[PDB]
């Protein structure tokens, strides 16, 4: 469980910032709110480890649920296609993410689940397609984050150097275009060393979360309600 850890209580990781006042306070304030976590390897491939596991374990066992994700998927290589990558070069990683939605359907077990996000191969390529299918998605809109994010900004080179490549860290463009590009509503609670309140964003603004992340010391773990 090197990638994607076992559940433990949320009061567990106090550990890892003993005699810190406001860590401790923030923690004990989670704990309200939320039962349980599961830690992630800090590699750079976090958010989207994370991201992709959560989601489809919240899956498991809601069949219309599951047949209307199935859907989206079997469309996302035209969206590929439409910001310019090749389909003998996204699909090694393409086959591997239908595989595992596959396999949510036919299994159905956390066990089997947790087995393909820890094996380094099978976790990697699924990591790889989540990274491809959210360049796509801001290629293809790219006035879209420029008129609401970016006004400024270079999309082409920024897709290219902080989206592509593995272990490149995400932001708040990452994050919206992903939870955009598969319909998935997420929330991240921030946990920082400022004297401040316990806080959380929403995305999209509007909606009822699927998935729950921490965010703390440049990690996304995840957490149960
Ligand atoms: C999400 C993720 O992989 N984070 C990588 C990290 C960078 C630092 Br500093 C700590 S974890």
């Given at each position: 469980f090197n990638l994607?850890?076992e559940?433990?209580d ?7 910032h003993?005699?810190?006042r406001?860590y401790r306070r923030?923690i004990?304030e989670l704990?309200?709110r ?7 390897k800090?590699?750079?491939?976090c958010?989207?480890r994370?991201?992709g596991?959560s989601?489809l374990?919240?899956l498991?066992?809601?069949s219309?649920?599951i ?6 998927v079997?469309?996302?290589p035209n969206?590929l296609l439409?910001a310019?990558?090749?389909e003998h070069?996204?699909r090694?990683?393409?086959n591997?993410?239908?595989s595992?939605?596959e ?7 956390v ?5 393909v996000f ?6 990697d ?7 491809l ?5 801001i290629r293809?809109r ?7 994010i970016?006004?400024?900004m270079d ?11 593995m272990?490149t860290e995400?932001?708040?463009?990452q ?15 921030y946990v920082?060393?400022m004297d401040?309140?316990?806080?959380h964003h929403?995305?999209?603004?509007a909606?009822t979360?699927?998935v729950?992340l921490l965010?703390?010391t ?5 957490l149960?309600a």
């Amino acid at each position: 469980f090197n990638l994607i850890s076992e559940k433990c209580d949320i009061l567990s990781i106090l550990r890892d910032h003993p005699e810190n006042r406001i860590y401790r306070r923030k923690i004990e304030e989670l704990s309200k709110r939320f039962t349980a976590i599961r830690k992630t390897k800090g590699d750079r491939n976090c958010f989207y480890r994370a991201l992709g596991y959560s989601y489809l374990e919240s899956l498991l066992g809601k069949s219309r649920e599951i047949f209307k994700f199935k859907e989206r998927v079997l469309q996302t290589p035209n969206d590929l296609l439409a910001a310019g990558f090749e389909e003998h070069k996204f699909r090694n990683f393409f086959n591997a993410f239908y595989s595992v939605v596959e396999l949510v359907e036919k299994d159905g077990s956390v066990s089997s689940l947790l087995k393909v996000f820890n094996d380094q191969s099978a976790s990697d390529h699924i990591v790889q397609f989540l990274r491809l299918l959210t360049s796509a998605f801001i290629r293809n809109r790219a006035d879209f984050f420029r008129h609401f994010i970016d006004e400024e900004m270079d999309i082409k080179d920024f897709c290219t150097h902080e989206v592509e490549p593995m272990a490149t860290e995400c932001d708040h463009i990452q994050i919206t275009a992903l939870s955009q590009a598969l319909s998935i509503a997420l929330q991240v609670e921030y946990v920082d060393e400022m004297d401040t309140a316990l806080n959380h964003h929403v995305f999209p603004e509007a909606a009822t979360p699927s998935v729950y992340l921490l965010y703390k010391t440049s990690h996304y773990n995840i957490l149960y309600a």
